[PDB]
Ligand binder design. Structure first.
Ligand code: BCL
Ligand code: BCL
Ligand code: BCL
Ligand code: BCL
Ligand code: BCL
Ligand code: BCL
Ligand code: BCL
Ligand code: BCL
Ligand code: BCL
Ligand SMILES: COC(C)(C)C/C=C/C(C)=C/C=C/C(C)=C/C=C/C(C)=C/C=C/C=C(C)/C=C/C=C(C)/C=C/C=C(\C)CCC=C(C)C
Lengths: 55, 43, 55, 55, 55, 43, 55, 43, 55, 43, 43, 55, 43, 55, 43, 43
């Protein structure tokens, strides 16, 4: 029956927003990225060599 | 009358992009494992 | 009464999206995978031998 | 008054989906199973004998 | 004015589902029980005497 | 006009399966406790 | 203007369910109590004197 | 026109079962505390 | 244009429930207070001097 | 047309019970602090 | 008038795929346990 | 096209409630502040010098 | 047609109580900091 | 077919609120920022050199 | 027909206050960093 | 009849801003990695 055409990326990337409503998901996406930044900082900051706290 | 509310056409089109992106993610992950193994062998 | 036919995978895999609305679930799926990547990194990074922090 | 018949399992197992809408619950079920796998890995991986990090 | 009759348990137990919609609550109930099993395992597994990791 | 929205018949049928599954879960849990006690006594 | 009468407890306790819909809140209440039991167990179990793990 | 949406009759019937179950939970908890005290005194 | 009159507390306190629907918020309020009690207990109980575990 | 949807009468009746229960909670908490202080002084 | 809103046919079709996928997951998990046991015995 | 006038604070502060419905957000705001108080207490209480537990 | 759904009058009345309660919270917090400083100086 | 014009930032920044309803998202945004402040404080405060607790 | 449901006018007015508050937050944060640096230098 | 409810035009306009902001975030992140490497080399 119906066969989908192969998508071309990044040309077709905008079609993400035909699935994902950014009204609902943009802030959760940005919060998810913030969580990653916090977790990465937690690991790197924990090494005394890689943190600014020198006093 | 699908549980999701998607048409067959929407599900198939969605699946086609999912497979494409998933495939690239897996290829990149495989490359990452290869490099990490060269840098620091495991097992 | 009605007996379901045996599905064929991966041919029938697209039928996931007839159950799971990707409008609702794609971002949670990707966030779940991100959480896995963070947890895997937490375990591996914790080993000093497997992290780049060398200074 | 009305008395329910004894169910036969696994014959009647499909009736779960007459109660639980998989549209809502399939992804949470799979995420719950993922959480179990992460927690099991956390315990087992924590033992140095059972993890691949050997360098 | 109205006085409720004393319930008889377990005879009247099925009336739980007249209050709690299992469509909404069955999966959360099962996830809650899973969480208990994980927490119990975490405590017991943490004792080296009670875990299979022997290598 | 139930709080849940279930009919009496639905609640009773649901309860019957719940009891069946719960019973098997408890029997399996009891077996697990027996085996764990044989492997590593507690108390 | 309108002055409320002093309630009599436990006689008026049933009026909780005129505010709190148990359809929504009974399972969360029971899960909250479960969480308390888990936390209490975590503290008490952590004392080696108060746990059954003796092997 | 209750905040919950329950009738008086529903609230009273709900409360009657709640009290019954709560009472049994408390009796069991009291028994548990008694046994734990015999096994390992506290205070 | 419109200027609000200064409220008198505790006389005007009941007006909280004109903003906050206790149908939605009473159980979350009580759960929040429970969380505080658990956290306070966690800190105090952690001191061996302030806990009953004496065996 | 209240933000909560409650009538004045509902808000006042709710508040009256809240105050009663809150008061008893605080009295019990005060008693608990007194007993804990007798058992193990703090400060 | 099902609690889920699914038809019998939908529930049965859903269950058929669930069973298939579950079965493959369990077979893979069994293989994983076999390999891990060969690599590092437990018990 | 339309240019917004510069707001004057604190005169225009009440306009927060034209954006944020306190019916939805007052309890979450107060819970957020409670969480801050708990976290601050956790840090300060952890210092033995700053806690009342003296026995 | 406010984003919140509140009228101007509701927002202003809400704000007036918020400010009152916030002010008392801050005064109490200031007193708490003063007492804690007398008990155990910091900095 | 349709090609979007390149946005100019910060001129077009106000268009965020055409996507993100601040009625829903302002408090979560502020809570997210609070969480960051708590986490940053947790790391910095943990260093004895950078905290006021001197007694 | 905006995704948010806001009018252009609402979005612009919201943005104007956001910018004002954000600016003051950043100025205060900058002052805090200056003071903390004087108290305890970092780097 | 999109899954998201967005028009093609809305999705494309949204994507155009997303790409712009994402690009600047990545450039800043790249600069941050460069500076951190100068300050404290890694690998
Ligand atoms: C810990 C031991 C090794 C290490 C070994 C590995 C190994 C092995 C892997 C990674 C992977 C990752 N590592 Mg690492 N990594 C290390 C240290 C780091 C450090 C650090 C602070 O030092 C950071 C920030 C990272 C960061 C990363 C991420 C870029 C990536 C996980 C992405 C993810 O969340 O997928 C899960 C999240 C999602 C799937 C959500 C969606 C994310 C996007 C949208 C994916 C869509 C794919 C799409 C097609 C991309 C198109 C763009 C272009 C084609 C590139 N690593 C050290 C040196 N790292 C993984 C990876 O490369 O995946 C490809 C991986 O397999
Ligand atoms: C820690 C000390 C002991 C140990 C002692 C015990 C004891 C004692 C018990 C377990 C139990 C369990 N253990 Mg153990 N266990 C150990 C180490 C492990 C390890 C490991 C990595 O080493 C793993 C992965 C497990 C895993 C498990 C699970 C299979 C099970 C908990 C299921 C659950 O979550 O119920 C809670 C979750 C739910 C109820 C959610 C729904 C789950 C399903 C759907 C239940 C429906 C029942 C249905 C009728 C099943 C039909 C199928 C067939 C009839 C089988 N154990 C060691 C060796 N283990 C428990 C068990 O066997 O339960 C029966 C149990 O009592
Ligand atoms: C830690 C020190 C002691 C110990 C001292 C105590 C003490 C003291 C108590 C417990 C209690 C419990 N302990 Mg213990 N316990 C110990 C070690 C364990 C171990 C273990 C791995 O070793 C396990 C699995 C448990 C498990 C349990 C649970 C069965 C129970 C908490 C239930 C609950 O969550 O209520 C909270 C959750 C809810 C209320 C949610 C709903 C649960 C159900 C639906 C309750 C409805 C009641 C209904 C009427 C039941 C009808 C059935 C029949 C009449 C029985 N204990 C050791 C030996 N334990 C408590 C108890 O017995 O409660 C009665 C209790 O007071
Ligand atoms: C840690 C040092 C001390 C100790 C010092 C204190 C001090 C001081 C206090 C407590 C309080 C409590 N302690 Mg203690 N406590 C200790 C060890 C324990 C142990 C244990 C395992 O050893 C347990 C299980 C507890 C348990 C408890 C709870 C019963 C109570 C907190 C209730 C709550 O969550 O309020 C918060 C939760 C809510 C408000 C949610 C709703 C709860 C119900 C519905 C309240 C409604 C009130 C209503 C009018 C009650 C009517 C019934 C009858 C009139 C009684 N303590 C040791 C010995 N404990 C507190 C208390 O007594 O509060 C009154 C208190 O002030
Ligand atoms: C800790 C000790 C051992 C180890 C012992 C085991 C054992 C034993 C097991 C695993 C399993 C897993 N391990 Mg391991 N594992 C180790 C170290 C690792 C490391 C690492 C960083 O070193 C990683 C990344 C992993 C990762 C994994 C996952 C691939 C897998 C759990 C999947 C899951 O979440 O199921 C739960 C999540 C879900 C069910 C959610 C849905 C996931 C998908 C969609 C499942 C659908 C199935 C479908 C039919 C798949 C079709 C595709 C093809 C047929 C393959 N292991 C070390 C070497 N590992 C498990 C496994 O293989 O499961 C099959 C397993 O039994
Ligand atoms: C850790 C070092 C010091 C200490 C130093 C401080 C300092 C400094 C402060 C506190 C504050 C508090 N401390 Mg302390 N505190 C200590 C040890 C304790 C112990 C203990 C177990 O030992 C406890 C239980 C507490 C408990 C408390 C709370 C009563 C209070 C935080 C309330 C809050 O959550 O606001 C945040 C939560 C909200 C705003 C949510 C809503 C709460 C209510 C509804 C507020 C509305 C205000 C309204 C006008 C009140 C009207 C009533 C009457 C006018 C009183 N402290 C030790 C001795 N403590 C703070 C305080 O006093 O705040 C005023 C404060 O500044
Ligand atoms: C943010 C969301 C809304 C808003 C909603 C509200 C609401 C709601 C309220 C206000 C209130 C105020 N708003 Mg406004 N407000 C907004 C935007 C603004 C803007 C701006 C330029 O954007 C400004 C200038 C203001 C200004 C003000 C103040 C006039 C007032 C708060 C006084 C106060 O808290 O002290 C500052 C207090 C502190 C910074 C904390 C102090 C704690 C101290 C430091 C404890 C430590 C002591 C201890 C010893 C430590 C040792 C010393 C240390 C080294 C310091 N708002 C936006 C539009 N605003 C409040 C008000 O009007 O009350 C009457 C009020 O209730
Ligand atoms: C850890 C090392 C240093 C320290 C270094 C710093 C540095 C550096 C900073 C702080 C900042 C903060 N520190 Mg500190 N701080 C220390 C110890 C403390 C202690 C303590 C218990 O000892 C406490 C309670 C605090 C508390 C605080 C907060 C008042 C503030 C973070 C607010 C926030 O959450 O923004 C994030 C949350 C939000 C944005 C949510 C909304 C909050 C409100 C509504 C903001 C709106 C702004 C509006 C215009 C305000 C109008 C009012 C008047 C103009 C004032 N610090 C020690 C001494 N601290 C930060 C700050 O000052 O920010 C301005 C900051 O940059
Ligand atoms: C740990 C080792 C190093 C360090 C190495 C790095 C490295 C490497 C990086 C950071 C990055 C960051 N670091 Mg650092 N960092 C250190 C110590 C700190 C300390 C501290 C207390 O000492 C703090 C507070 C920070 C804080 C920060 C953030 C400003 C930033 C992460 C933002 C983020 O969450 O993106 C994720 C969150 C989101 C994307 C959510 C949305 C945030 C906003 C809205 C982004 C939109 C972009 C838009 C175009 C901005 C326009 C404005 C102007 C053009 C600037 N660092 C030490 C010295 N840091 C990252 C960065 O610079 O990113 C650009 C980065 O790559
Ligand atoms: C029409 O008629 C109707 C409507 C039907 C009438 C019916 C009415 C009914 C049924 C109506 C019922 C209404 C009912 C049950 C009310 C019940 C009300 C209670 C029980 C209040 C209780 C509050 C308690 C608070 C706030 C507590 C704050 C604590 C705080 C902040 C501590 C913070 C602590 C720290 C940070 C320090 C941490 C230090 C460390 C970690 C060391």
């Amino acid at each position: 029956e119906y066969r989908p055409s192969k998508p071309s990326n990044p040309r077709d990337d905008w079609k993400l927003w035909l699935v994902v409503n950014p009204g609902t998901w943009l802030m959760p996406i940005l919060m998810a990225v913030l969580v990653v930044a916090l977790v990465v900082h937690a690991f790197v900051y924990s090494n005394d060599n890689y943190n600014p706290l020198t006093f | 009358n699908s549980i999701s509310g998607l048409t067959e056409e929407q599900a198939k089109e969605f699946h086609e992009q999912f497979k494409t992106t998933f495939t690239v993610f897996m290829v990149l992950a495989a490359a990452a494992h290869f490099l990490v193994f060269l840098w620091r062998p495991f097992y």
